[PDB]
Each structure stands twice: as C-alpha cells, then as structure tokens.
Design an enzyme around this catalytic site. Structure first.
Site, mmCIF file in Angstrom:
data_model
loop_
_atom_site.group_PDB
_atom_site.id
_atom_site.type_symbol
_atom_site.label_atom_id
_atom_site.label_comp_id
_atom_site.label_asym_id
_atom_site.label_seq_id
_atom_site.Cartn_x
_atom_site.Cartn_y
_atom_site.Cartn_z
ATOM 1 C CG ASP A 1 63.453 91.335 -8.388
ATOM 2 O OD1 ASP A 1 63.179 92.565 -8.552
ATOM 3 O OD2 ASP A 1 62.703 90.499 -7.818
ATOM 4 N NE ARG B 1 62.895 74.140 -9.873
ATOM 5 C CZ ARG B 1 62.833 73.690 -8.614
ATOM 6 N NH1 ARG B 1 62.186 72.570 -8.312
ATOM 7 N NH2 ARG B 1 63.360 74.413 -7.631
#
Ligand SMILES: [Zn+2]
Ligand SMILES: [Zn+2]
Ligand SMILES: [Zn+2]
Ligand SMILES: [Zn+2]
Lengths: 162, 167
Positions: free
Chosen positions: A91, A153
């Site tokens: 990011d 997940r």
C-alpha cells in the site's frame, strides 16, 4: 451464524488467482534456473498465496517465515543467499522498505520482493517491486488469507466487504 | 537440484486433496449453524490449513500459534477473546509422541473454550508418550521420516505438493 462469503462481493476470482500464481511461479523458475532461493513468507496474510506458490516452484528452495512486526531472520539464512520476500499487499511501502532494510543488512546475494497485490495510491516513495500479481484500485479487500477482525481469511477469492 | 529428486511419493497430492475434502465435509456438518475458531499450528500446518479453510462453509475465525520442537508455544496471533467460550479446532500437521498435542490442549484450554477439538493431517502412533483423543485424523502412517506438504527438515521440502519419503 453464517458463512462469511455472504458479506462479500468477488473482486478477483480464485481461477484468476490460480493463473497469476502460475505466471509468477514460471517467472521465478526461469529467473533462478539451476540456483537455490530462500522464499520468505510474510505472515500472516501471505500464507495462502505462499502455500499455492511454493507448490508450483521447481527449483532448489528453502522456506522461511517472518512477520512485519519482526523488524527476525538469522544472518546464517540471509548471507550470500538468494532471498525473495513474499507479501500479500503493498500500500504505502512502509513495510517494504523496512523488510528490504532489516534483511539487506546481512548481505544476501540477491534480494527481491514479490507481492500478490499492489495498491499504488498513498505510496511513500520509490519502491522496486520485482513481481506483482495484481495492481488493484484503492479498496478494502479480504479473502485468500487476508482478514478483517480474524474473519474472511478462508475465502478462496479476493473480496470486497458489502 | 529440485528437492523432489531425492524423495519418493508416499501420499499423493490427490490423496491429500480427497482427505482434506472429507475433513471439511465432516467439520461443515458437525458445526452446521455454529461458529468455529480454527487455530493453525505454524509452521508445519500452514499448507494443510490454507487448503482446508478454503473448503469450509461455516462461520469462522482463524488464529495462529507457533510450536517449536522441549516444545515452546508462541501466541503468534491468538487472542483470548476468540477462544473464551468459543468452539475451537486445533489444526496440526502431525502427532508423533503426543507431547506437542497435550501442550497445545493445555495452552489453548487455559482460556476456557466452550469446546476444544484436535485435527491432524498425519498420526504416527509409534512412540506415543500418552493416550490421545484425536477428533479428526486424515492419515494414520507408519514410523517413517516424512516431509512435504508443509512439513520441513531444516527448512527443506515444505514446497512438495505430496507427502514424501527421503531416499
Ligand atoms: Zn503483509
Ligand atoms: Zn516508512
Ligand atoms: Zn505441527
Ligand atoms: Zn508430554
């Protein structure tokens, strides 16, 4: 108590993920033809990507695991080795320069960074990503090992929260 | 040289796939309409875990604990609020002596889960130090040195898609 997928929209499909991981494994296999590589899994989020990648690699291989907050990998495992760091997401690139600083100080023969997902917005500075499966837009994503509050997940795909 | 060269296939990637499907359908049914916190035991169980969670269809939280063989447990990412009064299943790669097994039951169980089950991909009942209650077992195997599908020796062989014997 319901399955977490109903709270999500597919953003990248599991078949799309399988094709990118294949592409990445063919690339690593070629670049490191007849050499040995230490693959470093950045827990927790890269575990599923890592499990799928390493099964398609066909080179001499060592595997290691770290967390971002561990910058910790020993000099004996780094010095004069080929390292490839395996991450789920880049990011800002804050984690990246920390992994490339804290590992590079034990002088590997080569040091590369692979990420499954890259979000170019709010990029800190100059980051060299040697491998990128997907360049994605600036969105909050879960699944394929990436969580939110220990949920999601398990999804076989990369999803958006509805 | 690719590490597959000095191994022989003991359990194929197809046999594994099928056992993990079977385990996912047992868990989907046993916990129909309930929530489960799955605890992955790193490092060895990461690949088994990655494949298993993808076939589960129940409400899930995932947590991680590291066991190093003396056994040291580290709570890598295991928080009391996802254990206390929850349904836990511990996901492990192998049970051989049962020493790690009871240290895991003691370490998770001290947070007082509502239920606690143990799943293992491989069970090697030779040299057990105690009786164990394994809720789920994919494969009961012979006393041999096995590797692959996540299981290492000195950071080698985890990458193999199959369980292998060493030549
Ligand atoms: Zn990460
Ligand atoms: Zn920074
Ligand atoms: Zn284990
Ligand atoms: Zn014991």
């Amino acid at each position: 108590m319901t399955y977490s997928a109903e709270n999500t929209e597919v953003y990248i499909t599991s078949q799309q993920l399988e094709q990118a991981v294949t592409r990445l494994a063919e690339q690593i296999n070629q670049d490191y033809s007849g050499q040995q590589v230490t693959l470093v899994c950045v827990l927790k989020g890269s575990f599923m990507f890592f499990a799928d990648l390493v099964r398609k690699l066909r080179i001499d291989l060592r595997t290691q695991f770290i967390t971002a907050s561990s910058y910790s990998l020993k000099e004996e495992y780094v010095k004069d080795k080929n390292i490839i760091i395996i991450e789920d997401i880049v990011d800002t690139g804050h984690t990246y320069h920390k992994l490339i600083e804290g590992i590079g100080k034990y002088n590997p023969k080569t040091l590369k960074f692979a990420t499954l997902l890259f979000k170019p917005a709010r990029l800190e500075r100059d980051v060299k990503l040697d491998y990128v499966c997907f360049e994605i837009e600036d969105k909050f994503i879960v699944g394929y090992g990436l969580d939110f509050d220990e949920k999601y997940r398990e999804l076989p795909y990369i999803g958006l929260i509805k």
